[PDB]
RNA sequence: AUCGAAUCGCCACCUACAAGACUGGAGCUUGCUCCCUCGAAGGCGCCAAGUAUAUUCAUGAUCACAAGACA
RNA sequence: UUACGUCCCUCUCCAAACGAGAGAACAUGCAUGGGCUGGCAUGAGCGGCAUGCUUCUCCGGUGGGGCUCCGUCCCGAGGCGCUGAACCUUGAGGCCUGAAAUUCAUGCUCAGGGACACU
RNA sequence: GUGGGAUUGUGAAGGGAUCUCGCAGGUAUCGUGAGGGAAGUAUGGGGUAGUACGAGAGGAACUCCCAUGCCGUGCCUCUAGUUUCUGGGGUUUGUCGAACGGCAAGUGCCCCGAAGCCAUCGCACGGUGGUUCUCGGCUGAACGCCUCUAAGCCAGAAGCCAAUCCCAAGACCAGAUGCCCACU
RNA sequence: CGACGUCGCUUUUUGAUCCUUCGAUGUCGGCUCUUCCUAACCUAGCGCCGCAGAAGACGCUAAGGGUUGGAUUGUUCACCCACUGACAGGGAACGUGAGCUGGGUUUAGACCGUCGUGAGACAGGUUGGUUUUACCCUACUUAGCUGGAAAUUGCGAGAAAAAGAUUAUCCGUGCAAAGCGGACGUCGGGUCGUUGGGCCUGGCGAGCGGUGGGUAGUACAUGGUACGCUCAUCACC
RNA sequence: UUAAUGAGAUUCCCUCUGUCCCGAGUUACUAUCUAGCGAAACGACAGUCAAGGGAACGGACUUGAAGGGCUAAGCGGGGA
RNA sequence: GAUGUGGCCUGGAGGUUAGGACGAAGCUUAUGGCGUGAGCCUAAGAUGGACCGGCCUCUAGUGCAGAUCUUGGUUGGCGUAGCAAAGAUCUAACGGAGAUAUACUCAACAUGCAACGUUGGAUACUGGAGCGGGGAAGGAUUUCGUGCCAACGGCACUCGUA
RNA sequence: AAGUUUGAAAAGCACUUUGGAAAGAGAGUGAAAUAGAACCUGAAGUCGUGACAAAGACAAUGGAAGUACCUCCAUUUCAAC
């Protein structure tokens, strides 16, 4: 008989199977549609999630109750050290999908890029790309590279560059990994000849995030969510809890199927892996593209709040540390925990909305302690509240008298 | 390890030669970069030099940019068989949210593993003073910190192939743990 | 390098295309007449490198997977 | 069937029932300490018109009651001072040794071991 | 051919024969995407406008703009919840002679409490093209006229298919690459 | 919309039957959860009206999405209060008890009415009344290892590849063109089989390179790579 | 009829609350991994589905659609 | 369902005719041959160790796949479910075969683990309606010392109400 | 419930070696220890091991015809036979 009352089913059947992601990094499954009228450009960048904070800004949209009024928006800070281009790959269209034509490697590759080819790099012979280096720049090596490049011009419809992260430049103590994260970045815009020209010009060079994205644009985020291991149906799928009277347990699905079909359907909620799934998230507005603190210390200083602050909150980002490189401030939240590498992709949905077109001007960036109810924005503000402490007197007295 | 780095396969003399090969190759590359940075920093104008802070190892309270901290460590040599060390163990960080009835027995195993890792010994004897100190506030009142004295001694059962080391760990009473670092006592 | 094998048509002339209510080309009378390459052959290959002056074939003894095969 | 190498042991935690994963491979790697950030709310001890506290000589110093021999010593919850002090702060696993500013020190490692790769 | 093993059960050490097996792949990346899944869906307000329509009474809608319900995928900056950091304080009975330090009451109890986890109790995000239905038409015969149709066309539904999104080569990728080795 | 008649469809009602099960297929309702149907309540389109507007009636395509909170009752039904765009109807062993619950039904105790001489009876009322087992196989959910195209073998040879002394006997460029532009030499030896023969190898050079020594400026995010000059070494050789 | 009494049946009100809206966090012992020890129930043979007929509800039969092998933790749709 | 069969097979009896220590019965089989079959016979035993075959007749407790059949043994499940109330043990020394147990390499860790009894310390529990000290019923040597560890004390024991 | 049914005779395994022991490896007795003490024979079922046959997922088993490989099996033939 039919169910007594109707309610929507729990969970999205399009995110199946709810299994662990094949990779820990975020990878774009598709790239934004190529349009030949634009100049060649890169379409993605790899960043690292540092932490979260909140900002203050005026809202510009007319007709709203918050028009020309201040709002508070949570933001995510992602560290974006520059990326190194190490290779060029070309794809030709076939009736069974894209096929790689070949790979043009750079003449020199970084040590941290070659570490990706080893499980124990320090105790290995470290012979990666040693024969490729000797073969290249020779008479036959130069011809082979030219022939591969000509094949891209003749048969390729898609041109991608091979880029890798710089964990030496990140200088993060909690990240752990020393082998670079390698990904392919599609070159959109222009003709195929123009795409190869830009890719060749980028070989062995550093690429900054601000040359791939702009301050007020939106972007897509490809990332892997935080893992929770095995979880029950209540948490994994959001089913209701059974009454306290229930024998043999409450956090269960009461009926996992009718008598016929004499099977459990794939649409029934079951316990299993929860979290650590790859997700492509849409329309994350960039709120700031920050410069490295070594270059510009006043990262969190705005035209309205003149306090000299960096983006790093008092006491550091919890479990991550200091943001020492360029960074991207995305509106809202992104999937995955801190320290995790993430891919920022140029948006694929239309960007004609008023919300997506709005120009963002930050008025205040919070830098209070993320540890336990931060009430000071800077260390100087904390000093003015307390003044000299007992440990300040001891340190000063020894310096004032014993050393002088 | 891998077959290309096994001490038994390579041999003592070959292993030493390869280790010096890596050392000289890395040390020479450091000297090249030291000279180039010394040269281009002097050449660049004082207006440009403000941007380059800490690059040539000019900064204070800073690591050596050229090489790793470990490579600069002075490898004195093999420690003597009979060595005594005084150290502090932060017990509370190892027992956070442990079952209350197992805290004192677990602290004994944690101390034995801490010393065993340091001294490379499997026979780690706990002195009565250290055992009393761990239990002196009950099974769940283990102190947050303990100051131990570790003494390693050599004695092998007659007829056994491999020399046998063992440690004796005793309590060192301290009014406070502030400022106490690991020392090799005599 | 075991390894003895089953398979017995080659090509650098087919290895391009399209239409069967009309595709060799014209005329006016529109289904007949006229012109042409006459609208029913991919080219070779089958024992003298070419149609003749010729030349080793056995006893592998009357069938037997061709006992041999890079055309 | 030589080399490249992979795995186990060891260490770390973005992973995790166990497998598996992400990493490291003498590495500020680990350990202790220091500083920061934060939590609680002023430790023990001693003492009151100085022998103490605070400030560069000037400030500050109780208690309802009670006991001895006007004054003197004492008992007495609580209060005040030294004292935003003492303690805790990474651990299933906060920050700082790479912006500038006490803002970072010191120890430990001394040929890594084992198995496959390899009829 | 070469390398490594073995043979059927009453002995030993040697010779042959005959069988079986190995003889070229390993290891590490970046990608392809067949097939499978598949998701966003509704309401209100502003304005249109007291306008169209109507004798009057009454009284609409689309572009656009702003919110919201349900659902979905996450996240932890804020706010809230949670404490075996038994973190720091209090506080009751017992107890080590007292103080100190504590301890017992299976976390004694009370207040506050980081980190972590977590709530539409908080916060963020949730998209594009086609093929057609029904139907309305164009051209137009059959049937000199006529006719959306019968040959052709146009337009076109929250349906359906694909893009986007998730898993992904037992879909056996002669996809591309890094190192050895083998062959050469 | 449709009397008098008449032709159907359906198996969400009851009845009829007695084919299956009586060495046992767990009985009502609710809770939970998933899926399916369409005879369409709302949501998307589109016709027509006794269609001015507003509100509606009827009909077509369409099941993608949605279809509520409560009082009484064990209830299914029913009824009322209220919200809403709407509060449509159904199937899945009258879905779903090794998923729950156990209020009802239907043991033994007991009370009432009626009936019975009686023991007792009552699709009449009432109160109280044990809900067992998964570690097996599939299914499903996650989680590991792992060979295999003659789907383990055959040596059984098929490329969504190139384009030539039959892929050999060089590299670019071009249209499977016409053409055009490039290419390290020299002096010996050994060793096998029609032309400056194949292969192996040595000595002098040269060139393109890989590493290291010494040196100069510059680039890049600034410790760490590249680049000029010059030596040494190795490789093509 | 009835004061008092009642682990008796029923209705309403105050208080109170995780009964519920709507779930979240924590603890001990498990489950889970290991060392030692070590059963039972049950067991024709077995074990992927759709439809079809069939003793009218198939794991075997017909015609199609799937299906590489071996495994750990769960789970209660089927095994009438 | 009836009947027939110089139809097959088993334990015994009356006859007859044979075999066996140069190996009877029994048992084993990719041992073949014969028969449509029930079965018969040969071969081999690197099986066995003392009885037994054919034929005629007589005789009967005379032939098994199933009876939720009987008895004995075995078996997948399965190294699985589990061995989770009564809070708890730690440390050194002594004892013990119960260890510090090793081809090469090799300073120790990464190659002998885990477990016992006693004593001294430590910590905790019972908390006088007690895992205190004595009796009845019931039990009957469990008491004590020494020795001992095959079985038993569902883990263990060097300990024990063994 | 239970045949003590080893062997003709106990001749019931001295002695060496490893092990704490149980036992193992040798050596002996005996015609025979696979006759070693609940000891004649020693089945079936189940299990271990070595060798080989291969084999996807058609549950397995089965029938009929062939084939590949094996065969401690049987029979026949081996000179104008
Ligand atoms: C009273 C009454 C009516 O309701 C029922 C409910 C269940 C049953 C049992 C039968 N169902 C199928 C099978 O024949 C039987 O199964 C078993 C387990 O016996 C009979 C009647
Ligand atoms: K698809
Ligand atoms: K679909
Ligand atoms: K494959
Ligand atoms: K029945
Ligand atoms: K409608
Ligand atoms: K009744
Ligand atoms: K007969
Ligand atoms: K039995
Ligand atoms: Mg319904
Ligand atoms: Mg229901
Ligand atoms: Mg229902
Ligand atoms: Mg219950
Ligand atoms: Mg119960
Ligand atoms: Mg915080
Ligand atoms: Mg006590
Ligand atoms: Mg609180
Ligand atoms: Mg009926
Ligand atoms: Mg019936
Ligand atoms: Mg049953
Ligand atoms: Mg039955
Ligand atoms: Mg059932
Ligand atoms: Mg319809
Ligand atoms: Mg619908
Ligand atoms: Mg539906
Ligand atoms: Mg039912
Ligand atoms: Mg029905
Ligand atoms: Mg039940
Ligand atoms: Mg029920
Ligand atoms: Mg059921
Ligand atoms: Mg009931
Ligand atoms: Mg009467
Ligand atoms: Mg009743
Ligand atoms: Mg009753
Ligand atoms: Mg009762
Ligand atoms: Mg094959
Ligand atoms: Mg079926
Ligand atoms: Mg079941
Ligand atoms: Mg269960
Ligand atoms: Mg008889
Ligand atoms: Mg006779
Ligand atoms: Mg045999
Ligand atoms: Mg057999
Ligand atoms: Mg006979
Ligand atoms: Mg009988
Ligand atoms: Mg029998
Ligand atoms: Mg039976
Ligand atoms: Mg068993
Ligand atoms: Mg178990
Ligand atoms: Mg239990
Ligand atoms: Mg217990
Ligand atoms: Mg003791
Ligand atoms: Mg050792
Ligand atoms: Mg030991
Ligand atoms: Mg007590
Ligand atoms: Mg108690
Ligand atoms: Mg008392
Ligand atoms: Mg007592
Ligand atoms: Mg005794
Ligand atoms: Mg025991
Ligand atoms: Mg003899
Ligand atoms: Mg015998
Ligand atoms: Mg015998
Ligand atoms: Mg015997
Ligand atoms: Mg047997
Ligand atoms: Mg066998
Ligand atoms: Mg079959
Ligand atoms: Mg056969
Ligand atoms: Na715990
Ligand atoms: Na809070
Ligand atoms: Na009562
Ligand atoms: Na069945
Ligand atoms: Na079938
Ligand atoms: Na247990």
Between the alpha carbon of residue A185 and those of residues A89, A129, B124, the distances in Å are 10, 22, 56
The residue assigned the tokens 């960080």 is B93
- Structural contact between residues A233 and A271, judged by C-beta atoms closer than 8 angstroms: yes
Q: What residues contact B39, with CB distance under 8 A and at least 6 apart?
A: none
DSSP code, position B38 = H
Resolution (Å units): 2.5
CB contacts, 8 Å: B1 with chain A: 123
Round to whole Å and give the CA distance between A67 and A55: 17
Q: What's the CA angle centered on A299, arms A175 and A336, to 5 degrees?
A: 35
CA distance A391 to A92: 69
3-state SS, residue A296? coil
Assess A119–B contact: CB distance below 8 Å, yes or no. Answer: no
State residue A292 phi and psi, 5-degree precision.
-60, 145
Q: Give the count of alpha carbons within 13 A of A252, CB side only.
A: 10
CA distance A93 to A115: 32
Residue B108 CA to residue B126 CA, distance in Å, equals: 8
Minimum CA–C1' distance nucleotide for B80: H107
State both tokens at A125.
């012979």
Residues of B with CB under 8 A from a CB of A: 1-2, 4-5, 51, 53
Experimental method: cryo-EM
Rounded CA separation A237/A217 (Å): 34
**Which of A123, A173, A297 is the best mutation test for B, with the most CBs of B within 10 A?**
A123
- The nucleotides of chain D lying under 7 Å from a protein CB are 3-8, 11-17, 20-29, 31-39, 83-100, 102-118
Strand, helix or coil for residue B110: helix
Rounded to whole angstroms, the Cα distance separating A145 from B59 reads: 44
Nearest-5° Cα angle at A299, A295 to A300: 170
For A143-150, which contacts have Cβ atoms below 8 Å and span 24 or more sequence positions? A145/A104, A148/A90, A148/A101, A148/A102, A148/A103, A148/A104, A149/A88, A149/A104, A149/A196, A149/A200
Whether the Cβ atoms of residue B142 and residue B103 lie closer than 8 Å to each other = yes
Task: Give the phi and the psi of residue A272 in degrees, each rounded to 5.
Answer: 170, -165
Q: Is the CB of B2 less than 8 angstroms away from the CB of A120?
A: yes
Using DSSP bridges, classify how beta strands A182-188 and A158-164 pair: parallel, antiparallel or unpaired: antiparallel
What residue has token string 């890719």? A199
Whether any strand D atom is under 7 angstroms from the Cβ of A272: the reply reads no
Name the residue among A142, A80, A12 with its Cα closest to residue A286.
A80
E strand or H helix at B41, and its extent?
helix B12-43
What residues contact B3, with CB distance under 8 A and at least 6 apart? Answer: B9
CA distance A263 to A259: 8
Distance, in Å, from the CA atom of A402 to the CA atom of A395, rounded to the nearest integer, reads 11
What gap in Å lies between CA A237 and CA A315, rounded to an integer? Answer: 37
Bond before A62 cis per omega within 30 degrees: no
Please choose, from the candidates B145, B154, B166, the residue with its C-alpha nearest in 3D space to the C-alpha of residue B87: B145
Q: Is A393 left (phi over 0), alpha (psi -120 to 50) or beta?
A: alpha
**Is A68 assigned a ligand-binding role in the annotation?**
no
Q: How far apart are CA A35 and CA A346, in angstroms?
A: 13
- Phi, psi of A70, deg, nearest 5: -85, 145
In terms of Cβ atoms closer than 10 Å to its own Cβ (0-12, 13-18, 19+), residue B34 is middle
A263 has binding-site annotation: yes
Rounded CA gap, A58 and A361, in Å?
Answer: 7
Count CA atoms within 13 Å of residue A141 on its CB side: 11
Question: What is the spatial distance, in angstroms and rounded to an integer, between the CA atom of A64 and the C1' atom of E59?
Answer: 29
- The 8-class DSSP code of residue A209 comes to G
- Chain A, nearest residue to B3 by Cα: A124
DSSP result, A96-136:
TEEEEEEEEE-S---HHHHGGG-SSSTTS---TTHHHHHHT
Q: How far is CA B38 from the centre of its chain?
A: 34
For residue A261, is the peptide bond before it cis, meaning its omega torsion is within 30 degrees of 0? yes
Give residues with Cβ within 8 angstroms of B79, minimum separation 6: none
CA B28 to C1' I30, in angstroms, rounded, equals 86
The closest of A191, A183, A203, A180 to A87, measured between CA atoms, is: A203
Q: Which nucleotide is at minimal CA–C1' distance from B156?
A: H100
Tokens of B83: 């060595």
Instruction: Find the CB nearest B5 among A123, A294, A295.
Output: A123
Is B1 in Cβ contact with A125 (below 8 Å)? no
Report the distance separating Cα A225 and Cα A238, nearest Å.
17
Nearest to residue A195, comparing CAs of A151, A152, A159, A150? A159
Give me the numbers of helices (H) and strands (E) for chain B, helices first please: 6, 4
Sheet strands (E) in A170-298: 182-188, 206-207, 218-224, 230-231, 272-273, 278-290
Residues 6+ apart with CB under 8 A from B5: A123, B15, B18
A123 min Cα distance to partner chain B (Å) = 7
Consecutive H or E run containing B105? helix B103-119
Cα gap A180→B166, rounded to integer Å: 44
Mention every residue, 6+ apart, whose C-beta is less than 8 A from residue B118.
Answer: B85, B87, B150
Distance of CA A54 to the CA centre of its chain: 18
Distance CA A317, CA A371 (A): 9
Find the largest Cα–Cα distance for chain A: 94
Q: Beta partners for A290?
A: A327
Of A125, A294, A295, the CB nearest to B4: A125
Strand order in the sheet with B83-90: B83-90, B145-154, B165-171, B123-126
Helix intervals (H) in A211-328: 233-237
Q: Which residues of B174-184 are buried (b: 16+ CB within 10 A; e: fewer)?
A: eeeeeeeeeee
Residue A254 contacts B, CB cutoff 8 Å: no
The CA distance from A92 to A149, in Å, is 13
Contact of A123 with chain B, judged by CB distance below 8 Å, is answered with: yes
> Are A16 and A268 within 8 A, CB to CB?
no
User: Reduced to 3 states, what is the DSSP secondary structure of residue A335?
Assistant: coil
Q: Which nucleotides of E are covered by protein (CB under 7 A)?
A: 28-34, 36-39, 45, 65-67, 70-79, 84-87, 101-104, 106-107, 113-118, 123-128, 163-169, 171, 175-180
Number of helices (H) and strands (E), helices first, in chain A? 9, 15
Question: d(Cα A42, Cα A343) in Å, to the nearest integer?
Answer: 13
**In this structure, what DSSP letter does residue A321 have?**
B
Chain B closest CA to A318's CA: distance in Å? 18
**In the block, which residue shows the tokens 């994350």?**
A284
> How far apart, in whole angstroms, are the C-alpha atoms of residue B168 and residue B150?
6
A121: closest chain B residue by CA: B2
Beta-carbon contacts of B95 under 8 Å, excluding residues fewer than 6 positions away, are B103, B106, B107, B110, B142
Q: Residues 187-216 of chain A: which lie with beta carbon within 7 Å of strand E?
A: none
**Residue position matching structure tokens 């930050």:** A362
Cα(B155)–Cα(B48) distance, integer angstroms: 65
How far does the CA of residue B1 sit from the closest CA of chain A (Å)? 8
**Bridge-based pairing state of the strands B165-171 and B123-126:** parallel
Q: Does at least one atom of strand D sit less than 7 Å from the CB of A148?
A: no
How far, in Å, is the centroid of ligand 21 from the Cα of A1? 26
CA of A159 to the centre of ligand 31 (A): 75
Rounded Cα–Cα distance for residues A328 and A211 (Å): 12
Q: Is A184 strand, coil or helix?
A: strand
> For residues A194 and A156, is the Cβ–Cβ distance under 8 A?
no
* Cα of B3 from ligand 43 centre, angstroms: 51
Interface membership of A124 toward B (CB under 8 Å): yes
Pair of tokens at residue A248: 């043999």
Q: A263 near A257, Cβ under 8 Å?
A: yes
Strand locations in A225-361 (E): 230-231, 272-273, 278-290, 327-331, 341-345
Nearest CA in chain A to B55: A294
Structure tokens at A159: 């041109």
Residues of B whose CB is below 8 A from A294: 53
Cβ within 8 Å, pair B1-A123: yes
Cα separation, B134 vs B186, in Å, equals 25
> What is the Cα–Cα distance from A82 to A167, expressed in whole angstroms?
10
- Token code pair at residue B47: 């207006």
Task: Please provide the size of chain A in residues.
Answer: 404
Q: Show the CA angle centred on residue A81, arms to residues A78 and A87, nearest 5°.
A: 120
CA distance A86 to A79: 21
Distance CA A143, CA A197 (A): 18
Residues 340-379 of chain A within 7 A of strand G, judged by CB, are none
Alpha-carbon distance of A182 to A320, in angstroms, equals 22
Token representation of residue A208: 């900054």
Helix, strand or coil for residue A394?
helix
HSE of A117 in the Cβ direction (CA atoms, 13 Å)? 12
Q: Residue-wise over A104-139: b if at least 16 C-beta within 10 A, else e?
A: bbbeebeebbbbeeeeebeebeeebbeeeeeebeee
């Amino acid at each position: 008989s039919h169910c007594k009352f109707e309610h929507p089913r729990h969970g999205h059947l399009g995110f199946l199977p709810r299994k662990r992601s094949r990779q820990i990094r975020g990878r774009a499954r598709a790239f934004p549609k190529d349009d030949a009228t634009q100049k060649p450009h890169l379409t993605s960048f790899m960043v690292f999630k540092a932490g979260m904070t909140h900002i203050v800004r005026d809202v510009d949209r007319p007709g709203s109750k918050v028009n020309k009024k201040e709002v508070v928006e949570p933001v995510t800070i992602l560290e974006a050290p520059p990326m190194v281009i190490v290779g060029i790959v070309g794809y030709r269209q076939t009736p069974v999908g894209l096929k790689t034509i070949g790979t043009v490697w750079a003449h020199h590759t970084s040590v941290e890029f070659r570490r990706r080819y080893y499980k124990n790099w320090k105790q290995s012979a470290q012979l990666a790309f040693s024969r490729q280096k000797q073969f290249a720049n020779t008479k036959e090596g130069k011809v082979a590279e030219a022939r591969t490049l000509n094949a891209f011009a003749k048969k390729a419809s898609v041109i991608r560059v091979i880029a890798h992260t710089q964990l030496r430049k990140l200088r993060n103590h909690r990240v752990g990994v020393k082998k670079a994260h390698v990904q392919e970045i599609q070159v959109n815009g222009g003709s195929v000849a123009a795409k190869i020209a830009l890719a060749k010009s980028l070989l062995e060079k550093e690429v900054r995030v601000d040359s791939v994205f702009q301050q007020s644009e939106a972007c897509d985020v490809c990332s892997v969510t935080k893992g929770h291991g095995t979880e029950g149906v209540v948490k994994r799928w959001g089913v209701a809890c059974l009454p306290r009277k229930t024998h043999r347990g409450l956090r269960k699905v009461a009926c996992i199927g009718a008598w016929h079909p004499a099977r459990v359907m794939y649409t029934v909620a079951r316990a299993g892996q929860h979290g650590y799934h790859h997700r492509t998230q849409l329309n994350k507005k960039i709120y700031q593209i920050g410069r490295s603190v070594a270059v510009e210390p006043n990262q969190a200083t705005t035209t309205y709040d003149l306090t000299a602050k960096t983006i790093t909150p008092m006491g550091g980002f919890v479990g991550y540390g200091t943001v020492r490189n360029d960074y991207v401030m995305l509106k809202g939240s992104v999937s995955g925990p801190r320290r995790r590498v993430m891919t920022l992709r140029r948006p694929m949905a239309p960007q004609t909305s008023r919300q997506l077109k709005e120009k963002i001007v930050l008025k205040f960036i919070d830098t209070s302690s993320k540890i336990g109810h931060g009430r000071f924005q800077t260390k100087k503000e904390k000093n003015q509240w307390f003044g000299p402490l007992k440990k300040d007197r001891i340190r000063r007295e020894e310096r004032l008298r014993k050393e002088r | 390890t891998r077959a290309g780095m096994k001490g038994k396969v390579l041999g003592k003399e070959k292993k030493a030669a390869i280790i010096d090969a890596r050392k000289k190759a890395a040390e020479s590359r450091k000297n090249r970069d030291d000279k180039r940075w010394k040269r281009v920093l002097a050449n660049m104008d004082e207006e440009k030099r403000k941007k380059f802070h800490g690059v040539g190892n000019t900064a204070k309270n800073s690591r050596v940019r050229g090489a790793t901290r470990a490579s600069l460590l002075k490898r004195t040599g093999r420690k003597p068989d009979a060595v005594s060390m005084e150290a502090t163990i932060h017990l509370s960080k190892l027992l956070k949210k442990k079952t209350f009835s197992k805290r004192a027995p677990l602290a004994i195993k944690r101390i034995k593993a801490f010393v065993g890792r340091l001294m490379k010994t499997k026979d780690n004897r706990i002195d009565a003073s250290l055992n009393t100190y761990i239990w002196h506030k009950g099974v769940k009142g283990v102190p947050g910190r303990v100051r131990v004295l570790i003494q390693r001694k050599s004695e092998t059962t007659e007829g056994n192939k491999h020399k046998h080391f063992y440690t004796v760990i005793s309590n060192v009473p301290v009014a406070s743990f502030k400022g106490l670092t690991t020392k090799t006592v005599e």
